[PDB]
């Protein structure tokens, strides 16, 4: 936890698991605040043995620790090692929700948004639906960099790259979000020859790894 | 479908109201025939002007005017190339007017089809229902309904596509009472696991093939983002 020194105090432990339950080579973690309740917390995109999908969420705890986790979505229509998720509001509702980026064996790849919403009480994400797209060979998921933010400040979020080029190109592209989550066309921003900018010599500051 | 004394060719419904004519009223000893080039024409009373034309081609044809409604003009072929639309859609009881069903989920678990019935001033009369069935029968979390008339009765019935917990498909039908109710359900299709899916299947009721009965065409959307209309 933080304090008003900008340091931070002792760690404390909250929830934990046994060995042989979970296992960390098969954990995609993210973070947000998915119930609106004031309080960023986790979720895991789990690798469950067949590679599917299955996403927990670990709601905090007032103290700041988290509790029991609990499915939020689930999916065997997709491969967890082609999964990429990321996190945001992307369709301003003030409660943070998901997206999956996925890579394609056609070459191609694609965004799927799940939007978080309450159903009868019970907190889960909305179906999945596509985004983003783009043609075969257009761009190469693991030549680019992924950030998520509210780069236009209209109160929804969207997410920005910086793409390494087959000629060693970087350049900058951002999608924005529109009122239903669908994203606009990118938008081309900054560029630079790999003589100034080196793709792979340089990481970006991020709320969650990879 | 009835040639009137006043030359006025019509179609006519069982609630005795006019559903489509020609318009070729007063030309008294007007007599309507199909010609030989496959077209439906309505002549004059000195056998050679024009009144009224299908304005088709379809030698070897014939005209047939279908229990399912309406009335169809048909090549050699068995397809079709003009159609009056003389039909009523869901038409339950086949009194001459559209009605409306519907399936309620009771929150005891059981459920019933009701069906409300069209009135005279177009107004929709105090439902009925029919095959009530008990809690247990039906698993309603994952079913998608259709109307139509899938047996060519003249009167419509209605059909339910539902998913099961194995991730098979059934596809079900149930037949039009003259009572304005439904009948049992019963399978008309069914696929094992592993082909059709419901969380993919969009389906669309109407006649499609044109042969006079209706059926049942799917919008699929597969996962990897292609897609296929199929139809059954
Ligand atoms: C969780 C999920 O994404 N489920 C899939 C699907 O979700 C949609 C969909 O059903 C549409 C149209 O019916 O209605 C809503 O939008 C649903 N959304 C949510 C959040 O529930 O629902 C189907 C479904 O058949 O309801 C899932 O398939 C599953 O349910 C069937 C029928 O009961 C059966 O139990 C299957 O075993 C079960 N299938 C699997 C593979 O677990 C859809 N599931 C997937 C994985 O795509
Ligand atoms: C890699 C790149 O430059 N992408 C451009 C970008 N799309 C994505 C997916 O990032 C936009 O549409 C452009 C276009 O299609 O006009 C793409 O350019 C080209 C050259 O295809």
Redesign the pocket.
Same mark, same amino acid.
Request: no cysteine; proline share 0%; hydrophobic share 30%.
């Given at each position: 936890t933080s304090t008003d020194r900008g340091t931070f105090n002792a760690p404390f432990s909250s929830w934990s698991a046994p060995s042989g339950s979970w296992l960390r080579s098969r954990v995609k973690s993210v973070v947000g605040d998915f119930d609106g309740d004031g309080r960023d917390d986790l979720s895991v995109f789990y690798g469950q043995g067949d590679d599917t999908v299955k996403t927990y969420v670990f709601p905090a705890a007032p103290d700041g620790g988290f509790t029991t986790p609990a499915v939020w979505?689930? !999916? +065997? !229509?997709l491969d967890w090692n082609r999964t990429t998720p990321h996190a945001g509001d992307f369709n301003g509702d003030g409660r943070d929700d998901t997206l999956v980026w996925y890579d394609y064996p056609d070459g191609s790849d694609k965004t799927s948004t799940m939007l978080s919403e309450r159903v009868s009480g019970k907190d889960?994400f909305? !179906? +999945?639906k596509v985004t983003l797209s783009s043609p075969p060979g257009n761009l190469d998921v693991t030549r680019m960099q992924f950030l998520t933010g509210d780069y236009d400040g209209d109160g929804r979020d969207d997410l920005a790259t910086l793409n390494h080029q087959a000629d060693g190109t970087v350049k900058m592209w951002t999608w924005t979000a529109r009122p239903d989550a669908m994203f606009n066309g990118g938008i081309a921003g900054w560029s630079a020859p790999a003589s100034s900018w080196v793709f792979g010599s340089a990481q970006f500051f991020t709320t969650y790894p990879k | 479908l009835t040639l009137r004394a006043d030359g006025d060719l019509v179609v006519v419904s069982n609630a005795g109201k006019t559903l489509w004519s020609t318009g070729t009223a007063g030309h008294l000893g007007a007599t309507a025939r199909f010609t030989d080039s496959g077209n439906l024409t309505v002549v004059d009373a000195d056998g050679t002007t024009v009144l009224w034309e299908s304005a088709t081609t379809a030698p070897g044809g014939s005209a047939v005017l279908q229990d399912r409604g309406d009335l169809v003009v048909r090549d050699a072929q068995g397809a079709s190339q003009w159609a009056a639309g003389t039909e009523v859609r869901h038409d339950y009881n086949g009194d001459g007017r559209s009605d409306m069903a519907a399936w309620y989920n009771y929150t005891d678990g059981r459920d019933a089809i009701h069906t409300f019935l069209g009135g005279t001033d177009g107004t929709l009369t105090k439902p009925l229902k029919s095959y009530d069935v008990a809690d247990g029968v039906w698993d309603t979390?994952?079913m998608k309904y259709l109307t139509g008339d899938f047996n060519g009765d003249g009167r419509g019935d209605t059909a339910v596509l539902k998913?099961? &917990?194995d991730?098979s498909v059934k596809l079900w039908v149930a037949l039009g009472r003259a009572d304005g109710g439904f009948d049992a359900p019963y399978t008309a299709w069914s696929t094992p696991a592993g082909g059709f899916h419901? &969380?993919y299947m969009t389906p669309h009721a109407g006649d499609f093939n044109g042969d006079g009965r209706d059926d049942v065409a799917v919008w699929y959307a597969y996962a990897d983002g292609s897609t296929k209309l199929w139809t059954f």
């Open positions: 979505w689930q !999916s +065997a !229509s889960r909305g !179906s +999945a | 979390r994952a998913g099961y &917990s991730t419901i &969380s």
